Design a protein around this ligand. Sequence first.
Ligand SMILES: [Ca+2]
Ligand SMILES: [Cl-]
Ligand code: NA
Length: 279
Amino acid sequence: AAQTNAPWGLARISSTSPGTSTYYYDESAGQGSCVYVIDTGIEASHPEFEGRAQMVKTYYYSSRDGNGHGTHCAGTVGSRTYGVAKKTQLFGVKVLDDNGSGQYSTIIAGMDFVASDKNNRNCPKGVVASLSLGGGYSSSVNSAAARLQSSGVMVAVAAGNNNADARNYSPASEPSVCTVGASDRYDRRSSFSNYGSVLDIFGPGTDILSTWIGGSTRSISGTSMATPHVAGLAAYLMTLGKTTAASACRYIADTANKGDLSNIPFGTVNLLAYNNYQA
Ligand SMILES: [Ca+2]
Ligand SMILES: [Cl-]
Ligand code: NA
């Protein structure tokens, strides 16, 4: 399949070169997989989700996304126009309030929720969790993310936006999950992206167009935007049978575009997510 005039980030992950504008992907498009978006929620009624999104859990008086961040991330995973995996099922878990904040204990609970809740859902091709959040280092947050991974969910987490070594942030610093940095349309490391030995992969993160609340769209930047590209890619590759939840992060790194990014500090991987689709 070919989607013309796609957002640059979709075109980048199906290309060996920057500067193209068509997203190429296998038509299966993540059908039969599931992605949990653990965030401010998702505006499930947005036309771009086509009935494939639903809220399954909140820790606040409402399950609505009053912020937009969760809706944007979900759009990059799985919306019809802006999404990597256009036929995946999206499940929203609201661990962040409408200001974008949440306590670590609520975030841990939402991760354990997902590890259990997947046994209530039909996801024969596999289960992914996208975590576009983080804070200072916490062993208990890392352990929660390692549990979710070990339960059979591919966990993708944002590296952080501090232009610093991600070893001091959680859950970015957990070795067993997939930690995603951000790049821009010229194949430079995004100026804000964390780096370090704990990063596994880079994805498009600057000026990322996706869904927003009120049935709208908008372009924002952050490693929070790179992470759902990789989460959606994992779901896409698992539907194709190419990899499993346990090995998807390693598979994505092995099949990535290598050496293409600039402004990568010494000791950080120079790997850009790539779907290796050959029409
Ligand atoms: Ca990691
Ligand atoms: Cl609930
Ligand atoms: Na971010």
